[model samples]
Target: KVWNARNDHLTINQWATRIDEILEAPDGGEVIYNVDENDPREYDAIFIGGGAAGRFGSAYLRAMGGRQLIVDRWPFLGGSCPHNACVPHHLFSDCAAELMLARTFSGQYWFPDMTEKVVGIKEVVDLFRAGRNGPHGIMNFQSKEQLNLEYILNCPAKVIDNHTVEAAGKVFKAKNLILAVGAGPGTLDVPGVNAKGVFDHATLVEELDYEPGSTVVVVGGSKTAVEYGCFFNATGRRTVMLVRTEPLKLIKDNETRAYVLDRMKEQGMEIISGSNVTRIEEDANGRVQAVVAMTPNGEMRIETDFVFLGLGEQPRSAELAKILGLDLGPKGEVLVNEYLQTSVPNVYAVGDLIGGPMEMFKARKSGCYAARNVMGEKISYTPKNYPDFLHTHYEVSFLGMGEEEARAAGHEIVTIKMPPDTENGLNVALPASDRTMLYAFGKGTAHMSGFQKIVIDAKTRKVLGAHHVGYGAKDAFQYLNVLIKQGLTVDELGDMDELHLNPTEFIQLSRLRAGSKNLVSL
Candidate 1:
């Protein structure tokens, strides 16, 4: 069907009506708001979430002349990535990044240029609404484009059951649905995991009732733990980080991971690595008294009032999928093939809810792909076309096989290590650095299993799989994903340089520069 909307933001049906009908109502609109509890909700297109991906997809569909509804449980339009996931972590990260960049990259500070310029809490809140628009350059442009996009937001869409949702007590239906429900904190299975003193990472940030003299324990081994450890310590709370393994062995980013390890030591927060809690105990006041942990040093009692769990999150699309009877990945992600199509033909799933390596840029791009596909627009969903966009500094990005994975898959592994200075801005960090690791596996690793990775060589320009334990490793790897996906060789990447030094340029250079680390292992 041909869409014919007179106004840019209005659906084709609304344009045929009056301007009053075009104006946004109190809560999106009558049909979308579902304020009437006794009624059901129905539309041409419906999204189970009102987050970034959902909003973007709905907007795109409307632009293509379809009516859409976005329902979320949160009060605001922006989802986890905006409020908690990407934005908050980055806010605190930029704070830490500022100090690190000053110490390592340059003598001058630069992260302030990226912040909201707010002096205190009030000003920060005052500017929080507009801060998502980002700086006046490309970030601002994208924000503005999103602003102009058409979509309806009905927040806190309460789920009544598996088959129905009660938003303002009304039900809405659409032919095809997109479940962009996003994610929440991953928790521990300790005895008292659900106790009052325990909280997931996200909840810890929201509540402050844990007490002033409370000894807080932040658990996990990922970047989230690093970020939380650094942020919590920097904020003057002596946080004890409980990890399943050593910090170095657990974290994958090089610089920041090391920095977090060192900073935790330097800042005086206790680091309890190589162990996890197996039991919990409570005091007479009904408050959590202590956590019983099993460490290499033997059983130890670490006293803490609050325990923040940041192990990682699982996808939460079971409800949306259960109602539709769609196939799901083992991890609760919606099952989809190359077309981003679910097992049931018309429905499409995108973002972290589909489960692979979860990244905001990946999810956003996936949303775009799903949207275009649903709107009948031609778009490619191949891994080759998308660039990995992680926000860490010392980064890790790889598209093809790991040595073990490749060998297990029956390909001979050939590993290569190049210095990080041959590339542009990469050398700016350090010349002849040992900060990257390039691994490829094929017949003598010649055909290219596809990957470019970086970590700290300090100054020798070597690519070590062990180096990708820093905050920026993921961001640096986005470039590698580009070249490696196409099966490009080291020399070919150096010559053509399709990545061309944007951030990928550094990654390629880190992989191509001459190095003493022999290229073949097994």
Candidate 2:
């Protein structure tokens, strides 16, 4: 069926009538046709990939009275965020965190059941499926038998042109197209890597069953690697992490890099930095038994039951990009303008497909922005205010650029590093073991849990970056994020009455006071 969008409002039948009238009219006569008679069906907006990025845009456009069609490989909506990645990963990481904290206090090892955690995550996914577009949901078009706003599942669609898509032996057309196919687990190319007992992030989440004291080796140095390594180590696994580059360079701040590595080592996890895994070796049974790598100290071998490759995810829509004639980045990500509009005039892309900082909230925001632009709004998206976080024993989060990033970006910056417990604020909050560690960092006088580093423009005194590692760091950094986005000076942020029974006090305390000449230049 053909659909027409006018005045930013539309319906499938109305658009079909409009298309027919325009197609067959002589000069002023309106030609009409039955909906079922029209071949090569058309829609006002066609959304591909019903993941987080696609669902939000589909919902928003439908809510705005636009005729929309959503296509996915599954009957239920909601992307890898809920189905595989963040939801499941966080559950396991949270379990790991609590176990570590418990051990820190009680001096006993505790390993949570991975099976139960998987069950709990599956339950959450079930709730999402039932609540989303169900009978009693705001995203309720899936309940409609047929309408202008329809969602099609188990139909994988490929772009035929800027305005046309082909799916399941049927050709479909749309006025606007949205690409949000998302990403997949990044793989390794080593020999025998695909043998039994090898896993990526997604596969590992599904097949996470192992006895205590099992040996597991994690490859890569991304945050994914760190979290998985921490999780396995906390569960009493002989976890060893190998990174091809320096471990400190894998993360944002040097202090945080050092802190996390220190914690990992303290927990009996062996870290092999600047190492390259040449191949995965299997035993006589063809099961993964060890990994041989080239470390800085020369060839090294690590024995393990499984090897988890955490090299990070790559985009999953390169074929679609090729078919659509869309510009692509070096990593196969769709190249879009600031408005998320592709090189094709009527097509847009969002989420991991556009490919920087692959976080759920950023993907959702990209979807929203793309939807608005499709609605003829000239809005642009900036991720400067977005926060990147890693959760382990303590949360590590940062907003804006890192210190090295700021310097590389040609910003002459002033850096301020402050201990969270410089004034005895964290004595009771931290356990005795942690307090002792903090006392060493604080030179024995006070107990400091974690340090907050603030980067400011040396010339303007405006906040350029903020990094925090400590209890509630993720939540605390939100305050700094807002202040930095507002272009607030260090003194201005320091003047705020943000003091309360909250972690945000760390933000206020990190800001440099006026007349303080202790600003370290970078």
Candidate 3:
């Protein structure tokens, strides 16, 4: 309902009125409650995990006067994100950028103290955790003393029936259920993968104790691998990135992928693409010393001090999904309908378990939709409505479709590439940093530094996609997100004069024709 309201192009006051009307409605729609009364203990809703999705479901259901219970395996309220994954990675990236800024200003070599960095990250995690689960945190809902929701930590839950669940030898029942159990690190099946020095991305982030000069080998070609490889190389480590295919396959944007690849190489990171690790070799001390691989050329051995695997993650809720008789996808993702409901009646699944983009924003939204629908509101969810974002040397964001994706989807799309300069050929838009200037020079361009692309449907003249691959990309993408969300035409976007003078406004200045395949000259 909010999605429809926002896209209706109403005035702010009108939108607020619509929202209030929906929220104040008595019966939302035709209500469907599939409950089994055979069980003893009963809750309005039982959330089987305590990640972002789980928390959202329980919170909204409780807000609707539904008694809720959430069970999670971890002792903490926030899951891997705050404790180890996204939050920690963001902190590390900020530190890495600080190191770069220092090096740029000093004109001298600089090395980050990994131990000190880890200590600082731990402190930040503690503060973040306190803010999240503290007295007035979202989880506590202002005061746990008056909290109506029940949360079980450090207890794994399994489904006993349609309405029954077992956690730590205790069985609980609910009218509706949410399976929000998240995922774990993807592992390799190669020999010696479990050796002492082998580490997944999360483990490395949490427990890495290496110094600046340590040699590291990162295995995989996903975004996490790219970030960590770039992180290690930037922080004065000898880093090798091994990939089964070309790096950044998941990034989708060709320009961003090429730029990231070039940047990683310039930073002294060795990338071995189109290769598979045949075996991992450990020294007598049970520490990883080298990795044996089968590249396109032949078998080769690469030496390393530590190995970090970024092979991606596998869902940890599959067994529970199976026990609950929920239909799963080929990748073991729990299958859900437009309402985020699973195959079983009154059972819904969300978050990493549903597995399209596996992003927190989508997960949280899915949680809310599932819960709100359970509370008698009719709301649909779609992954395409959410934007994808990642940060490395710069932020890379994609909404809607890339050039290839648009083409494959059978849309007659016209691609426009915006150079980092004004139409009159001024270089004011380019970054002043020497590194970015050199990068621009290497790309055979004098002005274009932070390149942006806009894809539009040729027939309708409506914007189909927006991609950015440089500094302030995240900020720029926010504007593009609004345009895409509104499904605005190119004329509508070009007519807007509200934007400030920045790289983001480059989208507004576009004047390309449909027939050209080459990037337009500024």
Candidate 4:
């Protein structure tokens, strides 16, 4: 929530000494017993969640023959992605959208019927839950045993006033702790929020069929709400979406945005933009009957059979972060140094819990970097764009600084606008359109200080924050963080593309910029 989290170059272990004082002392209070006589549990490394980061982190530790205990209350691993949000939603969203698109465009009305016969959602999910889905959960589980992780299940993690993290009424000690507990689906506090069928996306998708008619109300925005809105409505259901604001910049790419927007409209979903639910009122059966909503223009009520909340997520490992005496943001994300280490030495916070956009690949890569830092490897690199690659579409990816931020940091902005449609060699829909633009900032010399946010603009090359939205969005932003870290410029990026992109390519580009001082090079 703070604009930027600044660090004072403090030591990693600087906060450990204050753990006892941070939590008050009393009889039967938690204590870190290093003494042999009373020591109950200890580990070289303790992982707080058995989810993605924890699973992967445990994998690395096991491969290195390190000892660990993976603790989590969630009965299963894979976190929200596989079990809840990403995978389950992907099944409904992608399959339903593709089938509907084919039926509408090709005049093939039987695809939906055929899909129903082929794999019903309930059946498909059942297979997945039963370990028949595929490699995701299997791989995560195998990795746990491979890493020698002692799995503790069904135990909610409790904070003994931040001094102790108690699970199932037992305390464990660790020389180093890794918090990868991840986040839960955010719920909005609204009137009638206590209504019986009011489900979070994570829980709703699992229940499948609910009260009849298939009419539902889903609140909040972001990928989850949008995806659910599109999915349910596409499949013969009526869906009403209440968003914090109008769906803005779904992908920030003009082409991709165009595609998504077109699809959303086609779904016949009704969205209430810039409106909030004041209260939720329930019927005699405890199901949500109506929700009172307030908009800038006026207030109204919407009748619904069910409501789903997807406001946002909070860091799951926050209590663990507190136990380690690490500083946290207001909502409880572990604070990290440039190297991604927490306040405790050799301990790290990765994935969505670290302050940034929520993406799986970003967290995965952060986990890798955290591992390297833990192994005492020398790493000066920081992640930039989360692997943005464009095939026929051009999307801009960025990290750290926006245009205004760059200017505030004392850099003159430089930019480029190469429309993907302009490329004669590539053939695709919506060609010759400037769906992508690049904005960069440099000093007197051409060395780019930091840049991000490329979007729509004019024919003569005025740039706005837009890009061609589709498939390769992940690729376009892939090297963004690394590029900014190296102080590269636009010229350097273009030059590399004229040949190819690489880690060292941008370093050479920075040197090409005049007055670009390289402390390490000097």
Candidate 5:
């Protein structure tokens, strides 16, 4: 199982050993795989989804020595993340990043007569397949099972009341009901809807497979749409994106998102703006024939090997919340305040079922907070410091209050843009620290690229937000969320000494008095 820590840094082997020791503990494997109809249906918490957020619900109770049951409609413990969405998407994107980097920095770094299309489709497809189906791909053996929590996979759970749920034709009761049903894929409903080759985020790769130069028509301008489109385009597929509007509206920084669009286009991904798909015409074998759309340039049609819908996500709570007597929004999203509770105190809804910015970490924290609140703690969930990220060519990761958020709070805002001397920082850290995984990964990122910034309150110079855009920036920003909560000001952070030559040194190096006399410049 993979492990993550805030302060403690350890190798994979070391982390694995620690996890192994815990899983080998007494009763650690006391998981109830299948439940008979006659068995007791009581639990401290009943999680109706086994995704990122749902996993934390039962996990908190398990760690506190309380009995819990986690349910998912699918055969796996994790939801769309591992099998369908984030995990697989990023895994493929990482490989694509390597490919694109090779095209530019080939023999200068890693050896091999490198050029475009150097890697074959078979290797790429196998990597994606292994990430999900291989022995190493199996991650449910990680925390959920190791925590000794009771779980029922492939169990379709439905809420009958605030305290009861009917799962797999059997009724179960719990003191705390966690509505972590998550969100379903937003659909593009129009003519020939049942046509083959149309895939949602969940079913994108299961049936459709292609080689370099194959065509992929991705509909939507959201983060998901861009990531998938970037992957295909970088991997040598002809990626054509149909954007109803602009892309990456959720990314807070302007330059960061603009860099993504520019690089993606520069790399040859065709983006069709203000376009809506009217219908999909297919042949007798259900193969897609023509993808007709109405664009700003008038009618347009495209013939493609695959069509993917990434318009948005539909909250799954509306359907079950209606019967549970919970207040719902216009489209049936469960309404909740900072407490993550519906009208019923014991009934908590979290993740995508509640609202948007439906990110993995936000869902995870909401899950834990809801569990804690249900356990008789009234701690509220506030996303002020929660991080948001978009994985792409130059991945975006930012957290804390943005510029407008600071301004709206009536604070005078001063936005500080950090110089992009990322490789120099990596140069310093690689030699300063032991060749551990942290610095080991840094060596390959020697290319001078990326942007960093810190938005602060002008009066106190206190950081309102921190943003990073580049390779490994998403990974590096993990600890920034924890650091941002400390409420350090720009001047304060600029003076702090970190591991010298570190990628994190950008902050320390950002201590500038004037444009000409750049202080702390590496």
Candidate 6:
């Protein structure tokens, strides 16, 4: 229970033995390693991933006095987050978000009407490379000499057995193993899909060569498609999105989904959800033609410069799992139990490779806890603690139970929805000093764009869920989970004077149930 291992990390049993030894000799002894210096083959644990699931866990395991070695197929340490998705996407998001606000807010009040917005992808790609490789870039954990953290990059690892692995033609042994190898998913099947004019979500960002001002066909309505579509439109390109799947399925609340889709529509996106793209071929003009199902008649083609696919992904490590004959799910994802231990007890798993929800927040915490569990702690991975954010132009986010889930649990729930708070940030962004100024100066009809949905238990007054869609909902949703975890009752939250403002005021506003019936006023 106690971690007094400054000199050397000690387990409870080891501490017990040391306590007995001290009593016998009054003082004497040192701790030990799993294997001594001669042959580096021995290890406390070998982690099979170097991504969100692998990185944090290795550090924690090291902190808990375990020697860790991580093997990743890529040359870099941080996974798709910094390399492909989160950080790289942020480069585009930050630029596009500014452009969006300029047209709606700054352009209206003081600045002249928005004329043009150009995305210098070359400059973004430059900074992207610099930030990713700079010494201080990704967590900067360069303590490789101690054997506490070491990475064997560009090497695909094969697990010969639970106790051992083969990487770079060298067999490595470990007391335990961690699998955090995330996936590299394939694109949807469409004729001419494999051509140069097509880009998967990763490649769309990776190649960094999707021409600006050209016509683009975004081939899905999922989170990535929405985000890229926003990027394209904001950057002064003509974008057409094909929604082949239910875009809002991940967003559980019906009202929240409706509100999000409505906001997207308001943003002037050309969303065609009824038909699916059957083929992507070239026309005589050398433009890409996306053939689709028409009405009762037949098929039609829409011309575009390129097609971007945000279809979905498949697990990468599942093939390795299959070869090992490890117990897996229908999707070939390695199935770990409540303890995060796979079918073979010594093999631990984390991240998308072990199956999904696949957000970095969940993966990071899961990795840290995976380390603890590997180092002899029994803790459950709570997926609910990790929130989900769509991070589109109008960011849609949710945390904790859905409305239906709360009802299924049989809680006496009372739901309250509020217009997006006219908080300080929106004012700052709009350059408006107050609510009066917000309307008086900016586009007259423009309301603060977003909504907050709070689900609370009527009897206990506990917050069952929190959902928001807006400009900064992602930033707000991050800490809302902390408050919920602290066991703050809904009434207590509203009454607390210590909260100051913004989200504090937002929670206070939650006291309003329906028209004119605010709990605080009543």
For model 1, residues 1-522, the per-residue Cα lDDT tens digits are: 111221334332232232223222454434223222223534445667756677677666766666566666543345676555667666765544343332332322343342222123222223433353232122212322343332333345554333344454456555666678876677677787867677665665454453434356777766677665555554445577778877644333333244435534754567787888887777777667788888889998878766767777788876666666778877777888776778875677777778765766666677767777766766867444444322232333333333344446444444433222233412222212223211121123111111233322222222223223333345545565554544544444345534332423443453454342433321
Candidate 3, residue 302: how far the Cα is off, in Å: 1.3
lDDT of 5: 0.67
Which residue runs of candidate 3 sit more than 4 Å off their true CA positions?
1-41, 105-148, 167-170, 209-213, 404-416, 420-449, 475-479, 497-503, 511-522
At residue 292, what lDDT does model 3 achieve? 91
Considering lDDT, which of the candidate structures 3 and 5 is the better prediction for this target?
Answer: 5
Q: After superposition, how far is residue 371 of candidate 3 from its true place, in Å?
A: 1.0
Candidate 2 lDDT over residue span 205-233, tens digit each: 45544432277888987778887777777
Q: Which whole-number lDDT from 0 to 100 does residue 470 have in model 1? A: 30
**What TM-score goes with each of the models?**
0.63, 0.76, 0.77, 0.64, 0.79, 0.79
Flag regions of model 5 displaced more than 4 Å. 1-42, 106-126, 134-139, 143-145, 209-213, 400-415, 418-448, 514-522
Best candidate (score: lDDT): 5
User: Candidate 5 lDDT, tens digit per residue, 274-354?
Assistant: 899998888889767668999998998887757778778888866676687788877667888898988876888888888
Better of 2 and 4 by lDDT: 2
Off by over 4 Å in 6: 1-41, 105-113, 116-127, 135-137, 140-148, 210-213, 283-287, 291-300, 401-413, 420-441, 473-476, 485-487, 498-504, 510-522
lDDT of 4 at 102: 41
Cα deviation at 351, candidate 6, in Å, is 0.6
How accurate locally, in lDDT, is each candidate?
A: 0.51, 0.66, 0.65, 0.51, 0.67, 0.64
Model 6 accuracy (lDDT, Cα): 0.64
lDDT of 4 at 424: 38
